[PDB]
Write an enzyme that holds these catalytic residues in place. Structure first.
Site, PDB file in Angstrom:
ATOM      1  CE  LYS A  33       4.235   5.889  -0.301  1.00 52.40           C
ATOM      2  NZ  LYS A  33       4.737   4.812   0.595  1.00 52.40           N
ATOM      3  CD  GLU A  75       6.363  13.505   8.012  1.00 55.91           C
ATOM      4  OE1 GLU A  75       5.598  12.674   8.588  1.00 55.91           O
ATOM      5  OE2 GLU A  75       7.391  13.960   8.536  1.00 55.91           O
ATOM      6  CG  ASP A 121       5.237  -5.623   3.187  1.00 53.95           C
ATOM      7  OD1 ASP A 121       6.155  -6.480   3.377  1.00 53.95           O
ATOM      8  OD2 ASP A 121       5.175  -5.016   2.101  1.00 53.95           O
ATOM      9  CE  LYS A 123       8.129  -3.332   1.275  1.00 57.05           C
ATOM     10  NZ  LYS A 123       7.328  -4.293   0.477  1.00 57.05           N
ATOM     11  N   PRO A 124      13.073  -2.308   5.119  1.00 57.74           N
ATOM     12  CG  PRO A 124      15.273  -3.080   5.200  1.00 57.74           C
ATOM     13  CD  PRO A 124      13.849  -3.558   4.988  1.00 57.74           C
ATOM     14  CG  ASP A 139       3.517   2.472   2.490  1.00 61.98           C
ATOM     15  OD1 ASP A 139       3.297   3.707   2.365  1.00 61.98           O
ATOM     16  OD2 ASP A 139       4.084   1.885   1.529  1.00 61.98           O
TER      17      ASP A 139
HETATM   18 BR1  LIG Z   1       8.825   2.848  -4.169  1.00 58.97          BR
HETATM   19  C1  LIG Z   1       8.465   3.074  -2.319  1.00 58.97           C
HETATM   20  C2  LIG Z   1       8.115   1.963  -1.519  1.00 58.97           C
HETATM   21  C3  LIG Z   1       7.817   2.140  -0.151  1.00 58.97           C
HETATM   22  C4  LIG Z   1       7.879   3.425   0.420  1.00 58.97           C
HETATM   23  C5  LIG Z   1       8.214   4.532  -0.386  1.00 58.97           C
HETATM   24  C6  LIG Z   1       8.261   5.902   0.197  1.00 58.97           C
HETATM   25  C7  LIG Z   1       9.429   6.674   0.093  1.00 58.97           C
HETATM   26  C8  LIG Z   1       9.444   7.960   0.639  1.00 58.97           C
HETATM   27  N1  LIG Z   1      10.606   8.775   0.550  1.00 58.97           N
HETATM   28  C9  LIG Z   1      11.939   8.165   0.526  1.00 58.97           C
HETATM   29  C10 LIG Z   1      12.599   8.469  -0.810  1.00 58.97           C
HETATM   30  C11 LIG Z   1      12.345   9.675  -1.453  1.00 58.97           C
HETATM   31  C12 LIG Z   1      12.931   9.935  -2.696  1.00 58.97           C
HETATM   32  N2  LIG Z   1      13.756   9.019  -3.272  1.00 58.97           N
HETATM   33  C13 LIG Z   1      14.027   7.829  -2.636  1.00 58.97           C
HETATM   34  C14 LIG Z   1      13.448   7.542  -1.400  1.00 58.97           C
HETATM   35  N3  LIG Z   1       8.320   8.436   1.218  1.00 58.97           N
HETATM   36  N4  LIG Z   1       8.122   9.600   1.814  1.00 58.97           N
HETATM   37  C15 LIG Z   1       6.841   9.601   2.309  1.00 58.97           C
HETATM   38  C16 LIG Z   1       6.273   8.376   2.000  1.00 58.97           C
HETATM   39  C17 LIG Z   1       7.236   7.674   1.339  1.00 58.97           C
HETATM   40  N5  LIG Z   1       7.182   6.408   0.820  1.00 58.97           N
HETATM   41  C18 LIG Z   1       8.501   4.347  -1.760  1.00 58.97           C
END
Ligand SMILES: Brc1cccc(-c2cc(NCc3ccncc3)n3nccc3n2)c1
Length: 290
Positions: A33, A75, A121, A123-124, A139
């Site tokens: 991120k 992770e 924050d 959220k799904p 997060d």
């Molecule tokens: Br854009 C967004 C907004 C908030 C959280 C995440 C997110 C998604 C995933 N993975 C879910 C995912 C992976 C691939 N494609 C779709 C969803 N991961 N894994 C570790 C941290 C994290 N944060 C992504």
């Protein structure tokens, strides 16, 4: 950044782009991120999160700060709850699985909250699931580090759907109750297959909340009329029965949900007390088909 091969863009998060990536050396698959601005306060807050380890909390593996740019390494999980709910709209998530997920999410909250760290924050989109029947909060703690903007870095609107009423009413201080609110909104959404309070502005959000739960007053919420964005001119709506709000949900469920959605944050159930609620007596851990 160069220690990682991008595998795929996952999306554009609150703070920046989120990538699936591989540690070029070790081969580890991670979520990378980027955090757009960095400030020493943020760096110190973040570092404390590396210790906030729990099976229902997505693990912060590393913080990389180089060339005034900031990257968080987590992770990786393959799927989030929003996509999962969408994919199962035809049939809905089976109740034993909603129950298992709620149970695990509350464990995650109880842990972080006991160390006085809030999400703010929930959220799904940041509830992540694996093929083992686990669910984890992504997060956690970041809102305190970087703020919560109105728009993301790509101008996408940050949702208000899961935001607690004390925030919308302009409280300066947040308690852990804000996460229990969000999580109750998500519980109701898993059950009904519809977002509970899909507001498209702060007042639409508030007024959706009031329409379902009643316009709050000094009886239900001591001190409410003195909050910064409260107005005496708010329309006064009557509370609806939860039998009408989340129909299929049983009496234990509806009773827990009501406590998670109490107006007064001091009255709102804690995560720890929620785990002891008779709703969770027959809790199991199914595997989602995925
Ligand atoms: Br854009 C967004 C907004 C908030 C959280 C995440 C997110 C998604 C995933 N993975 C879910 C995912 C992976 C691939 N494609 C779709 C969803 N991961 N894994 C570790 C941290 C994290 N944060 C992504």
């Amino acid at each position: 950044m160069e220690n990682f091969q991008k595998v795929e863009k996952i999306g554009e998060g609150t703070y920046g782009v989120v990538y699936k990536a591989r540690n070029k050396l070790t081969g580890e698959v991670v979520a990378l991120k980027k955090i757009r601005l960095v400030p020493s306060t943020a760096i110190r807050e973040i570092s404390l999160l590396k210790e906030l380890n729990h099976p229902n909390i997505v693990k912060l593996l590393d913080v990389i700060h180089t060339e005034n740019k900031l990257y968080l390494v987590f992770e990786f999980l393959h799927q989030d709850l929003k996509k999962f709910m969408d994919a199962s709209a035809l049939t809905g998530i089976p109740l034993p699985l909603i129950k298992s997920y709620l149970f695990q999410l509350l464990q995650g909250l109880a842990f972080c909250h006991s160390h006085r760290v809030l999400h703010r924050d929930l959220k799904p989109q940041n509830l992540l699931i694996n093929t083992e029947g686990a669910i984890k909060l992504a997060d956690f703690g970041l809102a305190r580090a970087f703020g919560v903007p109105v728009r993301t870095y790509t101008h996408e609107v940050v949702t208000l759907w899961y935001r607690a009423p004390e925030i919308l009413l302009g409280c300066k201080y947040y308690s852990t109750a804000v996460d229990i609110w969000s999580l109750g909104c998500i519980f109701a959404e898993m059950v009904t297959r519809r977002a509970l309070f899909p507001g498209d502005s702060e007042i639409d959000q508030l007024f959706r909340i009031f329409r379902t739960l009643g316009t709050p007053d000094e009886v239900v919420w001591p001190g409410v009329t003195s909050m910064p964005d409260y107005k005496p001119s708010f329309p006064k709506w009557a509370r609806q029965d939860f039998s009408k709000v989340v129909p299929p949900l049983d009496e234990d469920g509806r009773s827990l949900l009501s406590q998670m959605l109490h107006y007064d944050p001091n009255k709102r159930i804690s995560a720890k007390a929620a785990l002891a609620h008779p709703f969770f007596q027959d809790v199991t851990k199914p595997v989602p088909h995925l």
